């Protein structure tokens, strides 16, 4: 039963939310291999734990840059939340620690690369292929939302493909635990819900809007609302006029009309039946939800990888050194990290 799993999951989450783990490793235990990704706020590097040979992805955040960009609270949210959750399609936080200059989060490595890469190269996914990924997001959001968490940054760039072809959601930089309403303008423009951009105050329903954007993008190969500059994208979003490509099935079109619903009183995921209106939709009729959860469904795409520590599914980035000051920077701002 789903409900009995959720209550046993909320009891584990809460215990770790109230008493977070801190300082579980040090930098000198890790060999730095390669930069896998860069960010507004920081960089992610492939790292090897020397004593075990285990490979991890390490997010490094420069504390001074975090303060400048006013992300202190979001960064504390990210680590606090990540160390407390456990779910098959969320990346596992293994270790976290900090030094004089930086914050570090050492996570599970997914060698299949970002969904983003495979999507742009291939052009678009078949409906069955899109659906396999979408169902994993549906369940992940069912779990997250039951803990009062809003995710707020769904996009192909933050979905990694693991060795079996399944998804790991990474980057919880905008995740927040909220009962009720919140107001921050944050996210990625193409994935912003109209509520967010109109400054109305919003809730977990924004994530169901973004699932709509994601399914559309996966299946079409481009997002439903695009333009060269953000302000143009916001215009189209609030107007809420969507065109579907010819090749979308009518079941797909109907699910998407319910997810990309501007009026949050008619948006799927936000009605009296909640996540069940999505899971019971005709577009998901072939989906065995428990089999996805147990990962017993064979994946339509399994990425080719020659050994652990292989990075060929990732783009190349410019390598920078990790500089560590001899004086502690922003001690009291990150004391709880």
């Amino acid at each position: 039963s789903v409900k009995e799993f959720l209550a046993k999951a909320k009891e584990d989450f809460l215990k770790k939310w109230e008493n977070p783990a801190q300082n579980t490793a040090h930098l000198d235990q890790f060999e730095r291999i390669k930069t896998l990704g860069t960010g507004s706020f920081g960089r992610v590097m492939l790292v090897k734990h020397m004593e075990t040979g285990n490979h991890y992805a390490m997010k490094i955040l420069d504390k001074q840059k975090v303060v400048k960009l006013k992300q202190i609270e979001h960064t504390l949210n990210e680590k606090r939340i990540l160390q407390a959750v456990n779910f098959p399609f969320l990346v596992k936080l293994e270790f976290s620690f900090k030094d004089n200059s930086n914050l570090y989060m050492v996570m599970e490595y997914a060698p299949g690369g970002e969904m983003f890469s495979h999507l742009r190269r291939i052009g678009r996914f078949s409906e069955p292929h899109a659906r396999f990924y979408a169902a994993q997001i549906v369940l992940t959001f069912e779990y997250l939302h039951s803990l009062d968490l809003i995710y707020r940054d769904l996009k192909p760039e933050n979905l990694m493909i693991d060795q079996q072809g399944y998804i790991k959601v990474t980057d919880f930089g905008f995740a927040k635990r909220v009962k009720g309403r919140t107001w921050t303008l944050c996210g990625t423009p193409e994935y912003l819900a109209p509520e967010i951009i109109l400054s109305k105050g919003y809730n977990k329903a924004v994530d169901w809007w973004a699932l709509g954007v994601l399914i559309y993008e996966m299946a079409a190969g481009y997002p439903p609302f695009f333009a060269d500059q953000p302000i143009q994208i916001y215009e189209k979003i609030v107007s809420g006029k969507v065109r579907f490509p010819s090749h979308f099935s009518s079941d797909l079109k109907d699910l998407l009309r319910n997810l990309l619903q501007v009026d949050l009183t008619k948006r799927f995921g936000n009605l009296k039946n909640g996540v069940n209106d999505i899971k019971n939709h005709k577009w998901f009729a072939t989906t065995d939800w428990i089999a996805i959860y147990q990962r017993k469904v064979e994946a339509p795409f399994i990425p080719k990888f020659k050994g652990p520590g292989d990075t060929s599914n990732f783009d190349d980035y410019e390598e920078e050194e990790i500089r560590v000051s001899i004086n502690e920077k922003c001690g009291k701002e990150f004391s709880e990290f």
């Binding site: 507004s40 006013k70 970002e114 996009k155 944050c186 193409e190 060269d228 500059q229 065109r243």
Partner: peptide
């Protein structure tokens, strides 16, 4: 085509999040 308009746009690479 919409595809051709997307590919000609400035938003086909990794998209960075905005902050407040």
């Amino acid at each position: 085509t919409t595809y051709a308009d997307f590919i000609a746009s400035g938003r086909t690479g990794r998209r960075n999040a905005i902050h407040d």
